[PDB]
Amino acid sequence: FVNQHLCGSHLVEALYLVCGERGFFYTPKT
Amino acid sequence: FVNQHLCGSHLVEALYLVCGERGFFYTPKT
Amino acid sequence: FVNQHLCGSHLVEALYLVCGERGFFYTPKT
Amino acid sequence: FVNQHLCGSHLVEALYLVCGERGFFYTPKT
Amino acid sequence: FVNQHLCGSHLVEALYLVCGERGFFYTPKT
Amino acid sequence: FVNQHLCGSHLVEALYLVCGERGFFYTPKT
Amino acid sequence: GIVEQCCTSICSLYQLENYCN
Amino acid sequence: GIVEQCCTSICSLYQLENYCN
Amino acid sequence: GIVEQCCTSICSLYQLENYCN
Amino acid sequence: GIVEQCCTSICSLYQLENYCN
Amino acid sequence: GIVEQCCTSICSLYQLENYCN
Amino acid sequence: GIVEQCCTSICSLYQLENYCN
Numbered sequence: 525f526v527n528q529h530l531c532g533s534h535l536v537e538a539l540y541l542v543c544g545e546r547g548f549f550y551t552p553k554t
Numbered sequence: 555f556v557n558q559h560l561c562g563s564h565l566v567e568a569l570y571l572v573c574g575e576r577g578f579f580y581t582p583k584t
Numbered sequence: 585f586v587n588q589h590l591c592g593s594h595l596v597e598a599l600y601l602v603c604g605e606r607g608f609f610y611t612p613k614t
Numbered sequence: 615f616v617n618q619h620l621c622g623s624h625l626v627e628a629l630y631l632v633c634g635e636r637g638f639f640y641t642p643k644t
Numbered sequence: 645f646v647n648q649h650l651c652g653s654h655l656v657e658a659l660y661l662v663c664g665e666r667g668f669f670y671t672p673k674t
Numbered sequence: 675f676v677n678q679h680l681c682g683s684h685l686v687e688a689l690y691l692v693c694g695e696r697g698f699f700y701t702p703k704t
Numbered sequence: 705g706i707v708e709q710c711c712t713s714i715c716s717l718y719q720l721e722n723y724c725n
Numbered sequence: 726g727i728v729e730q731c732c733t734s735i736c737s738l739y740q741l742e743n744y745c746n
Numbered sequence: 747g748i749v750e751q752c753c754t755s756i757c758s759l760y761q762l763e764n765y766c767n
Numbered sequence: 768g769i770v771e772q773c774c775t776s777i778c779s780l781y782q783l784e785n786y787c788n
Numbered sequence: 789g790i791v792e793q794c795c796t797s798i799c800s801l802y803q804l805e806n807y808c809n
Numbered sequence: 810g811i812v813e814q815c816c817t818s819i820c821s822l823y824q825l826e827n828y829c830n
């Protein structure tokens with residue numbers, strides 16, 4: 525594919541598209 | 555007011571927004 | 585909850601999620 | 615070309631885009 | 645209408661709203 | 675895991691993300 | 705409503721301007 | 726599931742916090 | 747105001763509520 | 768169409784590449 | 789072009805139309 | 810990590826996969 529610049533809700537939308545119903549974790553550094 | 559169905563991408567958009575920097579798990583198989 | 589950084593259409597999506605069918609106004613300074 | 619249904623969040627996304635800095639009202643009870 | 649500031653996936657969403665089912669091309673400079 | 679229906683705006687969001695800087699054509703009449 | 709010029713049935717880009725401030 | 730407190734049937738903004746880390 | 751702030755600084759879901767119909 | 772490899776019925780992430788420039 | 793401009797500067801809905809199928 | 814990087818630098822779909830359930 526192609527590399528993406530993914531911030532905020534667009535990263536979350538990327539994990540949905542890539543993981544879908546397998547599902548995912550969203551874990552920002554703290 | 556009655557809140558809404560949230561499906562697929564709209565639902566992880568809602569999680570992001572609500573959890574933000576804490577982050578979240580989306581596990582649909584559950 | 586958590587504080588959010590919300591610009592452009594993402595703020596509009598935030599008001600939809602928070603107000604829903606009660607509804608809302610979107611009023612940028614001018 | 616025939617334009618489309620716009621529902622919930624897609625519809626306020628369309629308002630934003632179309633009104634921009636003027637802003638808008640979303641009042642669904644209407 | 646009003647002029648818009650449109651980057652990334654929001655430009656793509658703008659072409660969908662403006663072109664719809666006529667359809668469109670998305671062609672970044674290279 | 676079984677991938678999903680993508681409709682209207684969700685489908686061009688998926689194209690963007692997948693093609694990125696190469697860009698894409700969305701031609702629905704096809 | 706807007707849900708009725710626009711989501712129920714279908715409107716022009718022009719119709720959505722009806723709702724701009 | 727979350728697809729079941731939330732997309733199937735309907736949940737509060739509070740319910741979605743159930744799933745925050 | 748809200749528009750300005752939430753994008754320059756951070757706002758809580760609770761602040762956004764001040765804007766509902 | 769793409770509406771037919773992808774919204775009507777269902778496609779791979781690979782299929783959507785079919786449509787990249 | 790369109791991609792560049794609309795994100796660096798502002799473009800109108802009318803400019804985006806130049807790009808439709 | 811992923812969150813940080815993908816927004817500061819670029820990440821591939823393949824990197825995002827490391828995060829799936």
Ligand SMILES: [Cu+2]
Nearest residue numbers: 532534594654
């Ligand atoms: Cu954005």
Ligand SMILES: [Cu+2]
Nearest residue numbers: 563564624684
């Ligand atoms: Cu949708």
